[PDB]
Design a protein around this nucleic acid. Structure first.
Ligand SMILES: NC(=O)c1cccc2c1O/C(=C\c1ccc(O)cc1O)C2=O
Ligand SMILES: [Zn+2]
Ligand SMILES: [Zn+2]
Lengths: 456, 222
DNA sequence: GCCTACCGGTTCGCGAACCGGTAGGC
DNA sequence: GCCTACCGGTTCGCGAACCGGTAGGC
């Protein structure tokens, strides 16, 4: 990391490191019962100490010049151990009672709609606002990159909470994990106590947070880099970083009429809170997504299906394709375990865009997903391994698009019929879900841009 | 936990928020807990007991609202209770309990300032260590636990966390650590404890124990 | 051969000064 | 969270005083 500007000597003297270990640590301590939720940043520029309640004006600091440089190590490692409990070097860290815990820090030639697409998916201040509702610390999280091993442990804590919640474990068991999580990921609750992770959807909410937070740091990783040479334009630099060939499907096109039909037709009768309106259609072609999908063009039963996600995620979805949840993450929220989920209805997928009356525009995908021999399920069931000969899973719903009106498209079955009753009604799903447990089975075809019209 | 706080001045150093003069040592003073601008934690705003009631604060029931009320001396509790404002068997057990509650209050207080007269802090520290007790921080708190130890008994370790239980207002709260991240939350009115063993070194133990002290358990407020 | 006024040097006694660890304050 | 007045424990500084060696007087 760099120098903290609270010292006032940020662009004057560099932060020091002895060979490998960088003399700079950002500590944290939270007790849900007491309500305390504090930070403690220590640095060696001069030694600098910062402290207070995370996400508020509560706190203070002390910049202090040293007599010498060897006295700095003495003052630093002493203050460290006094506050954290451990020594500066260690094989594995161990938390101590009421001591702190250290957090692991690390002229454009394109169409106007394509420029707006980059404008939409690379505006990171819009992604910052998106995290404000989650109550993630807004102050120093953009400049302070939280580690990968750290976030995996944060995922693991959430998965431990769901396990604890499922079999009605002790309050202390839950209290610990709630403490552990908020220490590991600094939240901003202001002057009130951190809430306990006791619900089944509270972990899901914090699981969703980590998924979104990850993609913002990924969006930064793309934006920060490349070769800054005076030749290409700023928007073109960010386009090449996406590693995809995007094209604008014209409104006069015959294939464009199929998508607008697929949007208009497959709107849910129950999801009447908003009304869709297709602003644009983009044909999308990822780098080497056809090379990996060649295997599954042999596979039968291929369907063109919807898949929605936050506008913040589309920065990463283009660069890495659709990814399955990590093995550390909790299975809560998922109906049939971790995998890529798809729907035959635009509305059901469109809810995952997360739009409001203030933020109307949103993005939704259409991917040729090779389902193949399907494993059909009625009720929710967290699966680990698929049955023999099955390449996908299907969640059977009440309403299904008319199978006698299934139009084809480049050798792909597009179910753009309106809703009718299904074959079986002993299910706990209202609409269909299509699940693949391999990132190779998906092949993204179209990206849409949709305006939402509410009534308020 | 509580908004307000009352005690005898632990030092004649802190000033009074209203009049801004030094609150003298061992004097009845009241506080109001506020959020410190300088760090993540509550801080007491100490007042002179006289000055406390002119700021406009009106504690309806001191015993349930103000912290450290039960730890005060009995006659001083009544001063706070009065100044705050400005059937046969039922009333008998009710009235006879308040008789026994005063009996227990000023029994410990007689024992407390008896040890303050005869023993130094290091004697009281090594008293607790001999009985396998955690030595607390503070002068007032040390003889408070020694007096608790002698009258009722040497507190045995906690069931799960193996920490030290401590009397706090209305119960014995565990102050140990169930884990490194979280503090233990064991609470009880009837804790486990063996008998208090005074070492041989006590030439005034026969005088202190001669103050009509028999076997009895901790009595609590209603 | 004593005595004794004078001087350099060691010890002794006690209050000032020093100091590290800490309970109380904000 | 950090600052600092307070506590006990040891040291330090300096003048009284104690003391032995001595040279001018009778
Ligand atoms: N992505 C979609 O637009 C979508 C469409 C239809 C069904 C699902 C979808 O997502 C699901 C589940 C899901 C499960 C966990 C999670 O963190 C996020 C999720 O979107 C679903 O079950
Ligand atoms: Zn006053
Ligand atoms: Zn305990």
């Amino acid at each position: 990391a760099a120098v903290d500007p609270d010292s006032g000597l940020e662009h004057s003297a560099h932060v020091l490191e002895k060979g490998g270990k960088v003399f700079s640590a950002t500590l944290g301590l939270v007790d849900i019962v007491k309500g305390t939720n504090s930070y403690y940043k220590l640095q060696l520029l001069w030694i600098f100490r910062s402290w207070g309640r995370v996400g508020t004006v509560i706190g203070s600091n002390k910049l202090e010049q040293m007599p010498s440089k060897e006295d700095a190590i003495e003052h630093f490692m002493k203050l460290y151990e006094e506050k954290t409990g451990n020594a500066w070097h260690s094989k594995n860290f161990t938390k101590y009672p009421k001591k702190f815990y250290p957090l692991e820090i690390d002229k454009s030639k394109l169409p106007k709609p394509v420029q707006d697409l980059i404008k939409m998916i690379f505006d990171v201040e819009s992604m910052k606002k998106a995290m404000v509702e989650y109550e993630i610390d807004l102050q120093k999280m953009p400049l302070g990159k939280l580690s990968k091993r750290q976030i995996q442990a944060a995922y693991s804590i959430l998965s431990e909470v769901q396990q604890a919640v499922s079999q009605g474990s002790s309050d202390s068991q839950i209290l610990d994990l709630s403490n552990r999580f908020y220490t590991l990921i600094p939240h901003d609750f202001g002057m009130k106590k951190p809430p306990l992770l006791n619900n089944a959807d509270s972990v899901q909410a914090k699981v969703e947070m980590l998924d979104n937070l990850l993609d913002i740091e990924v969006a930064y990783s793309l934006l920060r880099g490349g070769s800054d040479d005076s030749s290409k334009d700023p928007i073109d630099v960010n386009y090449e970083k996406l590693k995809t060939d995007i094209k604008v499907v014209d409104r006069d096109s015959e294939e464009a009429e199929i998508i607008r039909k697929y949007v208009k037709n497959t709107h849910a009768t129950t999801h009447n809170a908003y009304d869709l309106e297709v602003i644009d259609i983009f044909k999308i072609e990822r780098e080497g997504e056809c090379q990996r999908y060649k295997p599954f063009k042999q596979l039968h039963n291929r369907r063109l299906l919807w898949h929605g996600s936050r506008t913040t995620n589309f920065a990463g979805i283009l660069s890495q394709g659709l990814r399955i949840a990590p093995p550390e993450a909790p299975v809560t929220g998922y109906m049939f375990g971790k995998g890529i989920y798809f729907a035959d209805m635009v509305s059901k997928s469109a809810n995952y865009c997360h739009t409001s009356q203030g933020d109307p525009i949103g993005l939704i995908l259409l991917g040729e997903v090779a389902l193949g021999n399907m494993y059909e399920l009625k009720h929710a069931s967290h699966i680990s391994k698929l049955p023999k000969g099955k390449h996908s899973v299907k969640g059977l719903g009440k309403t299904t698009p008319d199978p006698s009106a299934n139009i084809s498209l480049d050798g792909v079955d597009v179910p753009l019929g309106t809703g009718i009753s299904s074959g079986v009604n002993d299910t706990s799903l209202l609409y269909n879900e299509y699940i693949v447990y391999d990132i190779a089975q998906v092949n993204l075809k179209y990206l849409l841009k949709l305006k939402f019209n509410f009534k308020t | 936990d509580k908004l307000y706080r009352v005690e005898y001045a632990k030092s004649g150093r802190a000033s009074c928020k209203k009049c801004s003069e030094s609150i003298p040592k061992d004097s009845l003073r009241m506080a109001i807990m506020v959020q410190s601008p300088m760090f993540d934690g509550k801080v007491p705003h100490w007042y002179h007991f006289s000055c406390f009631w002119k700021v406009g604060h009106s504690i309806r029931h001191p015993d349930v609202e103000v912290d450290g009320f039960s730890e005060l001396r009995w006659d001083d509790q009544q001063k706070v209770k009065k100044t705050a404002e400005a059937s046969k068997k039922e009333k008998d057990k009710d009235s006879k309990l308040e008789k026994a509650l005063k009996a227990q209050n000023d029994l410990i207080w007689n024992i407390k300032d008896e040890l303050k007269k005869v023993c130094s802090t290091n004697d009281l520290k090594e008293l607790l260590i001999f009985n396998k007790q955690q030595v607390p921080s503070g002068e007032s708190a040390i003889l408070d636990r020694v007096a608790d130890g002698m009258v009722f008994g040497a507190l045995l370790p906690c069931e799960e966390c193996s920490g030290q239980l401590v009397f706090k207002s209305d119960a014995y709260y565990c102050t140990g650590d169930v884990t490194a991240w979280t503090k233990c939350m064991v609470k009880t009115q009837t804790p486990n404890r063996k008998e208090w063993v005074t070492p041989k070194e006590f030439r005034e133990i026969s005088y202190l124990k001669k103050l009509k002290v028999k076997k009895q358990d901790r009595i609590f407020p209603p």
